[PDB]
Design a protein around this ligand. Structure first.
Ligand SMILES: [Zn+2]
Ligand SMILES: [Zn+2]
Ligand SMILES: [Zn+2]
Length: 572
């Protein structure tokens, strides 16, 4: 009840009772909140409510102090002070942006913009509020009761009447009933249990409403520059394989935190694992939001770092299969590979946070909370995909608003930029270089002459809101008969539903752009499916075409993105 004011840190007894997080507001700040917003309930030891029996006045602007108690205009004694006067609310020890964050429903881009252009304590307030709102929204959706079981991977579902049904994809994970987490894909529908269970009829699934803990740590610890490499000890015998990165590795040592922008295939993993070889005694925690991102860092580490000094941290509430070739849950190994949400309370010489475009400010805060470290390294690419904002339906969230790291990378630039793509045929490198990297990304590879574009709008059907384009798949089927080398190709599209149909008709393995991120494949077939802001997003497009090492076929719906592809055009 006695805390610090989220805006100016001043001590007070005043929390807003109208904010979902109930932040401590100082007398001067609590005023400027309650006089500008629909937020009128002020809490303390005891609520600012009229003490008169049966009186329902809770609005602080309609309330007065009479003795050591509070009353409305109808009930106050002759000698009474209005609680709200002289730009203050009476409390012990006696902001536009705070107001917009406190009251917004988080459905507008402008909400996320302000949650990332504000002060550092407001970014945390913003982040808890957003996450709180995100969780209280999961309650809104309807329960999914099993009507009948078909096979070991398919069933039919009965939904709760009166409550909406949540988008059916791999994004939305339910907890079954505690028979383990589950996912669903398209009256036949496909069931995928984290725990293999003989699906029982009647049993129900509900969305995993996890409790939003308060944040304490900043998103970014304040920046420190050093004259000399602080708290780390470099090698002189540094493998030629990592010689390119020595000056960057010395930058990491001469700052508290550092930002690395590495476009696809430019050596992010190589740089991350290369940091351990350059500072060989240093204890490094390797963290990212997703199991895949951490598992990619584990695969790199397996190749170059001693396996006896590596641990993959796994939460006992195990969700997906992940990396098995380390000692599991040894927190005290020199090398710890762990998802943000599972991080132990520990210390480190270096923390490497990877896939930073996918991090929220909640995630950035948590990492600073659990890991006290000499150096924080932030790796990823603001031209790649952000974390889905499940509440955001209006406006598009630009890369400079993804999180504080991306904001820095897009405003003052990254500390370090990996400038040469070694994965992709030049046709792909030249396209994305112009599109999102201001022509600063260079091709190592030659043009493959295996990169093709076809402008084919086809016909757009919808599985609810998820888009399908059968004719675009028809064009792919036709291409495959004439191009048998592409038989091995991964099929990629911005929509699960399109992927479901392409799986059945083509037999290619299938991936959404968003799930493709971090992976690479010899051949990619991309069907844009629709012309929407989702399918035309330049970051998503960037990720889609940079998955390929040898060949790509893009069936396009959008003239702009089609024309920009520096590919050989096909006919039909
Ligand atoms: Zn409030
Ligand atoms: Zn204040
Ligand atoms: Zn009253």
């Amino acid at each position: 009840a006695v805390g610090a004011c989220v805006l100016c840190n001043s001590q007070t007894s005043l929390r807003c009772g109208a904010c979902i997080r109930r932040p401590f507001l100082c007398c001067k700040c609590c005023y400027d909140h309650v006089i500008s917003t629909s937020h009128k309930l002020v809490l303390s030891v005891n609520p600012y409510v009229c003490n008169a029996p049966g009186c329902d006045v809770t609005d602080v602007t309609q309330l007065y102090l009479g003795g050591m108690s509070y009353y409305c205009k109808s009930h106050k004694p002759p000698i009474s002070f209005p609680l709200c006067a002289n730009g203050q609310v009476f409390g012990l020890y006696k902001v536009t942006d705070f107001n917009a964050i406190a009251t917004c429903d988080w459905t507008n881009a402008g909400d996320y913009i302000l949650a990332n252009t504000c002060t550092e304590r407001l970014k945390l307030f913003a982040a808890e509020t957003l996450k709180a709102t995100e969780e209280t929204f999961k309650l809104s959706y309807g329960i999914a009761t099993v009507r009948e079981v078909l096979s070991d991977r398919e069933l039919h579902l009965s939904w709760e009447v009166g409550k909406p049904r949540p988008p059916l994809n791999r994004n939305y994970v339910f907890t079954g009933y505690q028979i383990g987490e589950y996912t669903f894909e398209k009256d036949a529908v496909v069931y995928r249990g984290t725990t293999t269970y003989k699906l029982n009829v009647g049993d129900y699934f509900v969305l995993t409403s996890h409790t939003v803990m308060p944040l304490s740590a900043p998103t970014l610890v304040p920046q420190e520059h050093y004259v000399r490499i602080t708290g780390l000890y470099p090698t002189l015998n540094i493998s030629d394989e990592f010689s390119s990165n020595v000056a960057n590795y010395q930058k990491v040592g001469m700052q508290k935190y550092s930002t690395l922008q590495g476009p696809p295939g430019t050596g992010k993993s190589h740089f991350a694992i290369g940091l351990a070889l350059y500072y060989p005694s240093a204890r490094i925690v390797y963290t990212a939001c997703s199991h895949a991102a951490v598992d990619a860092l584990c695969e790199k580490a397996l190749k170059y770092l001693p396996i006896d000094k590596c641990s993959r941290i796994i939460p006992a509430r195990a969700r997906v299969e992940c990396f098995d070739k380390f000692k599991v849950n040894s927190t005290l190994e020199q090398y710890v590979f762990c998802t943000v949400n599972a991080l132990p309370e520990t210390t480190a010489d270096i923390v490497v946070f990877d896939e930073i475009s996918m991090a929220t400010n909640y995630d950035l805060s948590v990492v600073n909370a659990r890991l006290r470290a000499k150096h924080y390294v932030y790796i990823g690419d603001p031209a790649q995909l952000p974390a889905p904002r499940t509440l955001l339906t209006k406006g598009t969230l630009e890369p400079e608003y993804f999180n504080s790291v991306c904001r820095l990378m897009k405003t003052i630039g990254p500390d370090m930029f990996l400038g040469t793509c070694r994965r992709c045929p030049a046709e792909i490198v030249d396209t994305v270089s112009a599109l999102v990297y201001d022509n600063k990304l260079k091709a190592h590879k030659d043009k493959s002459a295996q990169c093709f574009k076809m402008f084919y709008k086809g016909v757009i059907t919808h599985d609810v809101s998820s888009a399908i384009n059968r004719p675009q798949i028809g064009v792919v089927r036709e291409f495959l008969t004439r191009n048998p080398a592409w038989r091995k190709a991964v099929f990629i599209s911005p929509y699960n539903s399109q992927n479901a149909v392409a799986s059945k008709i083509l037999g290619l393995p299938t991936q959404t752009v968003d799930s493709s991120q971090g992976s690479e494949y010899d051949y990619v077939i991309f069907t844009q499916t629709t012309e929407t802001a989702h399918s035309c997003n330049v970051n998503r497009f960037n990720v889609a075409i940079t998955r390929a090492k040898v060949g790509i076929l893009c069936i396009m719906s959008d003239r702009d993105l089609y024309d920009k592809l520096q590919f050989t055009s096909l006919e039909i």
